[PDB]
PDB file of C-alpha atoms in Angstrom:
ATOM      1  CA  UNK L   1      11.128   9.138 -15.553  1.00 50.62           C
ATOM      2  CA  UNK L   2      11.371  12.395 -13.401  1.00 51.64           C
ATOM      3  CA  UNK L   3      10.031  14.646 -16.044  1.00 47.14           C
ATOM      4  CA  UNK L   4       6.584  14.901 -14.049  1.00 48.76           C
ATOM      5  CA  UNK L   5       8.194  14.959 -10.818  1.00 49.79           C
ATOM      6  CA  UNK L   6       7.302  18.028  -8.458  1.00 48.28           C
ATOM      7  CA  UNK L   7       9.985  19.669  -6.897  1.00 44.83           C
ATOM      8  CA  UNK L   8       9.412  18.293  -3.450  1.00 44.15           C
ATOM      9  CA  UNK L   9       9.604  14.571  -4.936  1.00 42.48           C
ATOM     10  CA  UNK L  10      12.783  15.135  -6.574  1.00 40.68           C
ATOM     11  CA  UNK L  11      14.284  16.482  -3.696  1.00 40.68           C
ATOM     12  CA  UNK L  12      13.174  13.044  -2.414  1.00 45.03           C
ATOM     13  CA  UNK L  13      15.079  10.969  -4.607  1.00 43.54           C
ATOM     14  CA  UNK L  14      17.965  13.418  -4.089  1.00 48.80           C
ATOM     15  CA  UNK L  15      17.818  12.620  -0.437  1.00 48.06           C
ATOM     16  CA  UNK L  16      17.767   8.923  -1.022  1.00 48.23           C
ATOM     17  CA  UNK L  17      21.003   9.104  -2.447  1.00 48.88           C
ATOM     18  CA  UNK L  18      22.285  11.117   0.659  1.00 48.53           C
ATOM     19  CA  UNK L  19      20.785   8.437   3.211  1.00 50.24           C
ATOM     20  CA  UNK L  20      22.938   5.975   1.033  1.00 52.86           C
ATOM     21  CA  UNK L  21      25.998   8.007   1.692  1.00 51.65           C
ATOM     22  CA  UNK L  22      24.826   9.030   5.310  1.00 51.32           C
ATOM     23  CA  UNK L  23      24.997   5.092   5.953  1.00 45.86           C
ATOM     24  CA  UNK L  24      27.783   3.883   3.961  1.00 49.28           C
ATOM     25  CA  UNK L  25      25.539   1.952   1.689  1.00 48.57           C
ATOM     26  CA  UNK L  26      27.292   0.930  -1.642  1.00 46.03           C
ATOM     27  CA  UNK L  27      23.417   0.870  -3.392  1.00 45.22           C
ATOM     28  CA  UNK L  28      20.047   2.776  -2.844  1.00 47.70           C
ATOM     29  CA  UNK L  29      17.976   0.786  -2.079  1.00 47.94           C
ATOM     30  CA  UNK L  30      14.129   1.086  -1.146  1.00 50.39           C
ATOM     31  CA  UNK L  31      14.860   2.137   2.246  1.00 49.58           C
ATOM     32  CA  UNK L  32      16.956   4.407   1.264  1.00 48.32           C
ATOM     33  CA  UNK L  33      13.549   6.506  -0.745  1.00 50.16           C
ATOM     34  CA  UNK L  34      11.912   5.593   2.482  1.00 52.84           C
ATOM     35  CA  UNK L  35      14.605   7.334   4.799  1.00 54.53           C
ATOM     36  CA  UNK L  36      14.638  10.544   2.065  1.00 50.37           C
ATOM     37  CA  UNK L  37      10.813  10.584   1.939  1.00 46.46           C
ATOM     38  CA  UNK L  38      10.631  11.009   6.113  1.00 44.20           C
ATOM     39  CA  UNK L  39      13.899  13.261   5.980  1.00 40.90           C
ATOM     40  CA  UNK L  40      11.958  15.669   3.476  1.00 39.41           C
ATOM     41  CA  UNK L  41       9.412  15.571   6.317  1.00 43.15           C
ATOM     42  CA  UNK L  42       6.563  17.870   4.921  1.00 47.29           C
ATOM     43  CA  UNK L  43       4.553  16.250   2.354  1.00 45.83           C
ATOM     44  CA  UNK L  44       1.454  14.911   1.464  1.00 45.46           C
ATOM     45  CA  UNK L  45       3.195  11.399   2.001  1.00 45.96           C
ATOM     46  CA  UNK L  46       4.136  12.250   5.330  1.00 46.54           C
ATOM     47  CA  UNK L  47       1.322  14.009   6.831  1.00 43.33           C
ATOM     48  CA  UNK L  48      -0.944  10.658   4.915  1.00 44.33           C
ATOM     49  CA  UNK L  49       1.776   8.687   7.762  1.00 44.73           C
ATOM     50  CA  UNK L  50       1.403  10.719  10.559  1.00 43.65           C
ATOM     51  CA  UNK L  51      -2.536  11.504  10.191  1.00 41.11           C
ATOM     52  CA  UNK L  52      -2.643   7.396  10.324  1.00 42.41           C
ATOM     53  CA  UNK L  53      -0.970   7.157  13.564  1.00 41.99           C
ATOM     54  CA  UNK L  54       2.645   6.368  11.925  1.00 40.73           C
ATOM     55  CA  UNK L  55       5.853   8.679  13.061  1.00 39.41           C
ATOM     56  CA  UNK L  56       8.080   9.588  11.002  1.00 37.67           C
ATOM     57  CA  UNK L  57      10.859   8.927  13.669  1.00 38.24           C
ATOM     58  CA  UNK L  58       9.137   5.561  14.141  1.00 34.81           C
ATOM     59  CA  UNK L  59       9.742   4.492  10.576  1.00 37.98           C
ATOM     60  CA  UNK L  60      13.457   5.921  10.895  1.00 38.04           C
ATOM     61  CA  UNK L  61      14.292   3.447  13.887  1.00 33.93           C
ATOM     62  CA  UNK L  62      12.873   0.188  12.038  1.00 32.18           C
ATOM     63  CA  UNK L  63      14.505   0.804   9.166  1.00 37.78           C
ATOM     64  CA  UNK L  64      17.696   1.505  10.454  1.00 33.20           C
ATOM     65  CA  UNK L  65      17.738  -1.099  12.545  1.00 32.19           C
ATOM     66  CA  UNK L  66      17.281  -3.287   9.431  1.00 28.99           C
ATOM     67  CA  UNK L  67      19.682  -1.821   6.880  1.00 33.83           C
ATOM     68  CA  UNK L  68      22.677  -1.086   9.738  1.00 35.33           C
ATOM     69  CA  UNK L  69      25.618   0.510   7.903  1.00 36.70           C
ATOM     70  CA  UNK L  70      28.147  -0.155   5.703  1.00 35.04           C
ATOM     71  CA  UNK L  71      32.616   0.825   5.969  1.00 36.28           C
ATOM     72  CA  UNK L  72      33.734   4.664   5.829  1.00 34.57           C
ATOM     73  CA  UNK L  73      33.603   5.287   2.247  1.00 34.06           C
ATOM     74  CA  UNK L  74      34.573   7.887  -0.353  1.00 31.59           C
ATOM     75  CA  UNK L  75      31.500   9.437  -2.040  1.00 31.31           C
ATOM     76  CA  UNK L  76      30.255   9.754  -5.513  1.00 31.71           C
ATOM     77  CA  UNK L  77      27.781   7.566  -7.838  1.00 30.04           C
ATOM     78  CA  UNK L  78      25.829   5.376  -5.789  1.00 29.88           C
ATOM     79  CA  UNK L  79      23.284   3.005  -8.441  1.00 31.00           C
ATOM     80  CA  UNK L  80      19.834   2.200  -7.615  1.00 30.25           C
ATOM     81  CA  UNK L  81      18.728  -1.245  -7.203  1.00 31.63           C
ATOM     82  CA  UNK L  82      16.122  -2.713  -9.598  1.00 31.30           C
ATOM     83  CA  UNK L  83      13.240  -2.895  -6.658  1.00 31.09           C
ATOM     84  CA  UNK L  84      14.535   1.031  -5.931  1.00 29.67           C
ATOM     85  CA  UNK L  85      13.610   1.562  -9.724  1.00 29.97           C
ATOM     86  CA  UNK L  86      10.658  -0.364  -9.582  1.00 27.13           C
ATOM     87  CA  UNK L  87       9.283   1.801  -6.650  1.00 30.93           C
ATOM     88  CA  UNK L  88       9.323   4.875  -8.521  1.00 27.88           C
ATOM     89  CA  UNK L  89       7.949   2.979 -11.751  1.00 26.32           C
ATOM     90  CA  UNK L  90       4.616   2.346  -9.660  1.00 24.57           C
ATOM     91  CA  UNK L  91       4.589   6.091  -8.503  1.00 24.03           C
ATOM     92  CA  UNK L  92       3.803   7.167 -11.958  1.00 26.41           C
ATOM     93  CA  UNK L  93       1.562   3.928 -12.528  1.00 25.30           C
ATOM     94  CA  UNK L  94       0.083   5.777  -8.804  1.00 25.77           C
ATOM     95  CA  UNK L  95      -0.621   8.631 -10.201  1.00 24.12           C
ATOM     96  CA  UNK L  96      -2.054   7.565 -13.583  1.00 22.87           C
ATOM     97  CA  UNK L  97      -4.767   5.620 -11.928  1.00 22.80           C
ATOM     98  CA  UNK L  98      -5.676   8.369  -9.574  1.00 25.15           C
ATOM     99  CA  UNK L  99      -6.064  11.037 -12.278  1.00 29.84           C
ATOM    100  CA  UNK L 100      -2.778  13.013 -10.875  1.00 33.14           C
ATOM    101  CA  UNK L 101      -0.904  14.924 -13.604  1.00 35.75           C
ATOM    102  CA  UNK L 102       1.917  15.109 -11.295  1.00 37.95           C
ATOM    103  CA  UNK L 103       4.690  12.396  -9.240  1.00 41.12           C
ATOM    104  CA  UNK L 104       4.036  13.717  -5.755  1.00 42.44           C
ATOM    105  CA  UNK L 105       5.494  12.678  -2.443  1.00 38.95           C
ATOM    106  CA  UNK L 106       2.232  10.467  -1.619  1.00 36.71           C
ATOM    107  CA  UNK L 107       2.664   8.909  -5.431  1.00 38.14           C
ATOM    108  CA  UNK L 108       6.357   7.884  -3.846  1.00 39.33           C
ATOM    109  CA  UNK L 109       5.050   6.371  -0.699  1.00 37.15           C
ATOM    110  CA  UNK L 110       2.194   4.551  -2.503  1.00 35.01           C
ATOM    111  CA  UNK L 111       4.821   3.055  -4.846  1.00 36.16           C
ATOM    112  CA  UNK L 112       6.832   2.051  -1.786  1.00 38.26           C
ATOM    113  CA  UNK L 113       4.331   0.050  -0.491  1.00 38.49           C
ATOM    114  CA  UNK L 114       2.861  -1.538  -3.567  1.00 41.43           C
ATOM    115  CA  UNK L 115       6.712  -2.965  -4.468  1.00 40.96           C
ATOM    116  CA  UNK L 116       5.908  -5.163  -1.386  1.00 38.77           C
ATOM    117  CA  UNK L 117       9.173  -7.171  -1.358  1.00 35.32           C
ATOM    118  CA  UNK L 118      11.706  -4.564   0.403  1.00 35.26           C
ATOM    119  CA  UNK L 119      12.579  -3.273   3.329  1.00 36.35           C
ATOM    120  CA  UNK L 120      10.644   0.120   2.953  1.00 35.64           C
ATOM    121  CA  UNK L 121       7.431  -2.198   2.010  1.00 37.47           C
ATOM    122  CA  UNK L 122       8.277  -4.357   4.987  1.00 40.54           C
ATOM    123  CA  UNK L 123       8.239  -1.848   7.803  1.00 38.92           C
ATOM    124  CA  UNK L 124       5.485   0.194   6.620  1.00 38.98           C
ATOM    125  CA  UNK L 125       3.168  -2.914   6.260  1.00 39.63           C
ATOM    126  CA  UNK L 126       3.981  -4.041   9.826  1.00 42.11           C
ATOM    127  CA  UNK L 127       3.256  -0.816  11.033  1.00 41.00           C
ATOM    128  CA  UNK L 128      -0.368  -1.047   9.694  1.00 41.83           C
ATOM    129  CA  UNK L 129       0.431   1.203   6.018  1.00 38.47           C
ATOM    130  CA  UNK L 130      -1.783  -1.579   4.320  1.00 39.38           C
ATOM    131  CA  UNK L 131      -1.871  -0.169   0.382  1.00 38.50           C
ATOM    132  CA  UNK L 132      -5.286   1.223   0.311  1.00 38.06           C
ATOM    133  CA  UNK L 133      -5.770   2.363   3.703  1.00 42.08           C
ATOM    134  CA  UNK L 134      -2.948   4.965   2.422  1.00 41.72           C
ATOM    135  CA  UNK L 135      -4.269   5.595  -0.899  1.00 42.72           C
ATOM    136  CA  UNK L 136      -7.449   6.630   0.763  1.00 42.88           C
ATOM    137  CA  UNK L 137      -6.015   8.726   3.204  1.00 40.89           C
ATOM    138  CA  UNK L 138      -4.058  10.482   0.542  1.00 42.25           C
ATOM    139  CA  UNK L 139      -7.155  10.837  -1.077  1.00 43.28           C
ATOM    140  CA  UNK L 140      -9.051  12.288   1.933  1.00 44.88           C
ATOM    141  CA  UNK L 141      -5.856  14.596   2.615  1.00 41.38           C
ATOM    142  CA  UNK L 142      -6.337  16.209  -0.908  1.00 37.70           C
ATOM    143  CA  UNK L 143     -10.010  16.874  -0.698  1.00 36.59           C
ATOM    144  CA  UNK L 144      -9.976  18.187   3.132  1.00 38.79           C
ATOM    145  CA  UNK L 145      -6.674  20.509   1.746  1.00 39.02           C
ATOM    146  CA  UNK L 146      -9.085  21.388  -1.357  1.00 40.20           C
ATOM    147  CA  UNK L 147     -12.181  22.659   1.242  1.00 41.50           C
ATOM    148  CA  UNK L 148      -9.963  24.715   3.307  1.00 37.82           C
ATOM    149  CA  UNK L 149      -8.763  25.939   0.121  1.00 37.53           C
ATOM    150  CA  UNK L 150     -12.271  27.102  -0.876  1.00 35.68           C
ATOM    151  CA  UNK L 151     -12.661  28.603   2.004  1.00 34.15           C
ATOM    152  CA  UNK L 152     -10.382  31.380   1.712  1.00 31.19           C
TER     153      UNK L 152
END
């Protein structure tokens, strides 16, 4: 599932799995891609947040406050929930229908939202990340990022 993944995205997921541990969490959940996707930090996904009046440290405190944390644990294999699976099945389904040949950050975030049932989809939502108000701004970051491009 990661074959098309860009470096960047898979660093992602590998952050997910840290969050998890970071928090005590016994599963990774989609808050978990959520907190890994604003830990990265430097994305198209997160710059798509930021340029829509969303912070990044914003997101952090509502979904903390959510997901609270688990008992000191040892580490090792933490499994992804279905909806955590699910997430990254719509980032390629993302990326197919805008004519990406790559799993991006902003293909994560837009699967995020889509899932619509968890906590990531919850708190984004409520703070105004309505589904195609991203996808367009991801959209819009991409071509403004192309014209600079042909400018130098």
């Amino acid at each position: 599932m990661f074959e098309r993944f860009t470096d960047r995205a898979r660093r992602v997921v590998v952050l997910a799995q840290e969050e998890a541990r970071m928090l005590n969490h016994n599963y990774i959940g989609t808050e978990h891609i959520l907190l890994g996707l604003i830990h990265e930090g430097e994305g198209v996904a997160a710059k798509s947040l930021e340029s829509l009046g969303i912070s990044l440290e914003g997101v952090r405190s509502q979904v903390e406050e959510i997901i609270g944390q688990g008992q000191q644990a040892p580490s090792g294999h933490i499994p992804f929930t279905p909806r955590a699976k699910k997430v990254l099945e719509l980032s390629l389904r993302e990326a197919l229908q805008l004519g990406h040949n790559y799993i991006g950050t902003e293909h994560i975030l837009l699967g995020l939202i889509r899932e619509g049932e968890g906590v990531a989809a919850q708190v984004l939502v409520k703070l105004g990340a309505e589904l195609t108000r991203v996808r367009q701004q991801v959209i819009q970051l991409l071509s403004g990022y192309k014209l600079a491009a042909a400018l130098e």
